[PDB]
């Protein structure tokens, strides 16, 4: 049965791997990394690697991403003694930064030359922190881009479109970490569960190894058009950089109670197919969960961009 990861490296990252812990999470094992051996110390996480203490004596990185990647190549070895056994690693971090842009790169280099399936996802910064740092935090996700198999970029401007002018920063921040918490969970929830018509891991690497950018999303439905209406809110993207359209390939399933009717699961399909704008290579699951009683459940995984 696959190990699943979540490893937060950098200010940002750890924040994630917190409020994830705190949201309640179980059958993922979480990783702390940083140079900020005092935000490491109030890490919620049961693993913590302090990365760059010899270099860097505790602090952070400030803002130069040569200082992450050194730190993270001086720790390789507790990286890899804290990934062993991971089928799967989930990579979050904020890029930008010293630790995060420099380090997260290396952490998923290590992951994938270790032999687990490794996806990203990062943060873009906010447009009001500068051009150099939003430079700086794109040279860091091409370097994220090219040491993973699926990437999933969060542009934190795209927060203060979601957001209104009294919802705290926390609560956009809540936001944020759903994209991968709930990645996380539908893979979690595939894995565990053999469906009617079922995927398994080996399903997930088929649609996530060696892609590139990546679309991840759960939408929940109930009544008439709940088919139409989740299948539309799992591909739906208002805080990604990378949309459904020009998806080529899709892991898709479906979740409901005895009521699920083939219908609603051609309907699903059709507006994934359509709104890709793509011939789709689909690899369909669907799981009965009689617990469900009119709620339907789409999970979305999409990749294959040019
Ligand atoms: N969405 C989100 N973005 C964050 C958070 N913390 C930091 N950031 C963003 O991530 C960038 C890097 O900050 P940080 O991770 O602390 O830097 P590092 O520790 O040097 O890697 C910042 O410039 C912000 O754009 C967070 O909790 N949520
Ligand atoms: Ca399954």
Do not use: C, W, Y
Request: glycine letters at 12%; hydrophobic letters at 45%; proline letters at 2%.
């Amino acid at each position: 049965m696959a190990t699943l990861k979540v490893i937060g490296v950098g200010g940002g990252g750890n924040n994630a791997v917190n409020r994830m812990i705190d949201h309640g999470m179980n059958n993922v094992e979480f990783i702390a990394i940083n140079t900020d051996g005092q935000a490491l110390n109030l890490s919620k996480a049961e693993s913590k690697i302090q990365i760059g203490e010899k270099l860097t004596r505790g602090l952070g990185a400030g803002a130069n991403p040569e200082i992450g990647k050194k730190a993270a190549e001086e720790s390789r070895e507790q990286i890899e003694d804290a990934i062993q056994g991971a089928d799967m690693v989930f990579v979050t971090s904020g890029m930008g930064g010293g630790t995060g842009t420099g380090a997260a790169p290396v952490v998923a280099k290590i992951a994938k030359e270790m032999g687990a399936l490794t996806v990203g996802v990062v943060t873009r910064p906010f447009s009001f922190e500068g051009r150099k740092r939003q430079t700086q935090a794109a040279a860091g996700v091409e370097a994220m881009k090219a040491a993973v198999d699926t990437l999933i970029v969060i542009p934190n401007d795209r927060l203060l479109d979601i957001v209104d002018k009294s919802t705290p920063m926390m609560e956009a921040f809540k936001e944020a970490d759903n994209v991968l918490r709930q990645g996380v969970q539908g893979i979690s929830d595939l894995i565990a569960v053999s469906g009617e018509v079922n995927l398994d891991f080996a399903d997930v690497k088929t649609i996530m190894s060696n892609q590139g950018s990546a679309l991840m999303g759960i939408g929940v439905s109930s009544g008439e058009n709940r088919a139409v209406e989740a299948a539309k809110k799992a591909i739906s993207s208002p805080l990604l950089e990378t949309s459904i359209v020009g998806a080529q390939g899709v892991l898709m399933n479906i979740t409901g109670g005895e009521s699920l009717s083939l219908f609603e699961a051609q309907e699903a399909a059709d507006i994934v197919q359509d709104a890709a704008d793509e011939d789709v290579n689909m690899i369909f699951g669907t799981v009965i969960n009689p617990e469900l009683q009119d709620e339907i459940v789409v999970t979305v995984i999409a990749t294959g961009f040019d």
